[PDB]
Amino acid sequence: MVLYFIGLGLYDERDITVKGLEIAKKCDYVFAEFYTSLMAGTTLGRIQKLIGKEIRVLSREDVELNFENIVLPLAKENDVAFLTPGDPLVATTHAELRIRAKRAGVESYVIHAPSIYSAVGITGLHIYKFGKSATVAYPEGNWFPTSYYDVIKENAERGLHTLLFLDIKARKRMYMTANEAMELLLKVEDMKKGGVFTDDTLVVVLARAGSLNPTIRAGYVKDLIREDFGDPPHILIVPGKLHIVEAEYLVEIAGAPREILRVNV
Amino acid sequence: MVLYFIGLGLYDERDITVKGLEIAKKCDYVFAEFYTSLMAGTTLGRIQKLIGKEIRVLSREDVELNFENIVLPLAKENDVAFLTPGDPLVATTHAELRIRAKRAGVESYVIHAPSIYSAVGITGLHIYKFGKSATVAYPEGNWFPTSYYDVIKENAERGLHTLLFLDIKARKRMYMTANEAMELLLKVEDMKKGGVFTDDTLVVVLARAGSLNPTIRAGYVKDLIREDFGDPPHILIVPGKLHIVEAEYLVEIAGAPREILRVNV
Ligand SMILES: Nc1ncnc2c1ncn2[C@@H]1O[C@H](CSCC[C@H](N)C(=O)O)[C@@H](O)[C@H]1O
């Protein structure tokens, strides 16, 4: 009789909320997509085992083109659930799917889950200081994306931190690393020469957030660009002017250079 | 030797993640703070019942002043859990507590949970378009804070949305409503005349995020200022220019006026 959008969280099958699980367990049909983000600490099997249902995985095309033909038809006579990594409506276009549900006469409900958007709090950077966000897109062909560069500039100019989602090619199983993101930005700087991103720029890397032992490292681009941050997914953050307490955390927890402790008020 | 920062999520005792609940159960001691925010849809008893552990509630002073003397000692020879509403470390003062753990020779891990910071994605507004965040605080005595007004101005100026956390009197359990927030903003406008928040401003109200029946409403201040959005907690959003898809969601899902499709896009 209804459609539930249930988030699965950051890293493993246990990042789903209790609410999400109890509801998923009772649904008649369970669908899911795993292309918007990467859950590096679980497997389909482990999720199916936890939920106790067979999970039909949909591709980007299945959702974007046939969500109303594959999922919605069943939601009219049964309790159906649509699973996604992290939070279902964050950094995705899944919100529009609720409009499709409505027009098909299907009531929908949303069950949230931990999101990278807020998990960045673990980096010690004040969440309220994050500005506009952006995604570092893999260049393809003769098209070289640069919008994410402008976002960093605008935020930094206002003293705001910039969260950078990193590209992903689910089918090709290619997950952009922080290292690759840094390389691309240095290239954009050479083009625009805005002083936005250089070897001296302080940056923060968060890898496999959600895991019990995430990789959190802060430092200058010149020293981190070739560092190994472990398996994906990775997120890159270009901080704005730091509060002393932020700097203290980056140094004590993310092993940043003790010189950042001396902020230039 | 291990301290666990566990997020309780958005609204009720089921908003904790499966990972958080299980870890909390295996802990010898369980502490909790309910001053950075509250869990409006549940009670301490229901949370205790779910965890199956006695939960010692700590005040603000307990944490900020005596965290190392109340929680860390037991964490040296036991598994201790520290529960907080939402996602740990989103509240600005939490991060520092991890540094205290380190200096006490105690390991700490963070178990995430849904945060309102990310749950706002249910409003249909693109998460990447949210800029700096702010808190609307109740004026008191001869003190009238207005910095949240400037945040809205700078974000909107760059086409970004502004998330406004609303004040809360933790002990008294008094929640500032979106209505009160709107009234305060109109008063600040009358004083600053910046043309940032008026009867014609479009706003979005999200009430009881996390609940299965949250209230999602969007409209002009003149029409929503005295509307009843239901029980707390309420969150207010002043969106910037809208992408057509955001507007269609606000209209179809949040009951916004068709007018927004031409005036705010
Ligand atoms: N656990 C994690 N650690 C680091 N980055 C992560 C992450 N989970 C997601 N991301 C980042 O976000 C991108 C997917 S964007 C989709 C995000 C999702 N709805 C959420 O709420 O988290 C990834 O390519 C990656 O850069």
Which descriptors would you attach to this protein?
elongated; 12 strands; alpha/beta; 265 residues; homodimer; 2 domains; five-stranded parallel sheet; 10 helices; binds S-adenosyl-L-homocysteine; Cobalt-precorrin-4 Transmethylase, domain 1
Largest interface: A-B, 63 and 59 residues
Q: For this structure, what is the CATH homologous superfamily of the largest domain in chain A? A: Tetrapyrrole methylase, C-terminal domain
- Name the bound molecules: S-adenosyl-L-homocysteine
Structural class given helices, strands, pairing of chain A?
alpha/beta
Order of helices and strands of chain A: EHEHEHHEHEHEHEEEHEEHEH
Alpha-carbon Rg of chain A, integer: 20 Å
Distance between the termini of chain A: 58 Å
Q: What is the CATH topology descriptor of the largest domain in chain A? A: Methyltransferase, Cobalt-precorrin-4 Transmethylase, Domain 2
What is the highest CATH level, the class of the largest domain in chain A? Alpha Beta
Number of helices of chain A: 10
Oligomer: homodimer
Total E-strand runs of chain A = 12
Principal-axes geometry of chain A comes out as elongated
Largest sheet of chain A: 5 strands, parallel
Q: Numbering strands along the chain, what is their spatial order in the largest sheet of chain A?
A: 3-2-4-1-5
DSSP strand (E) fraction of chain A?
Answer: 15-25%
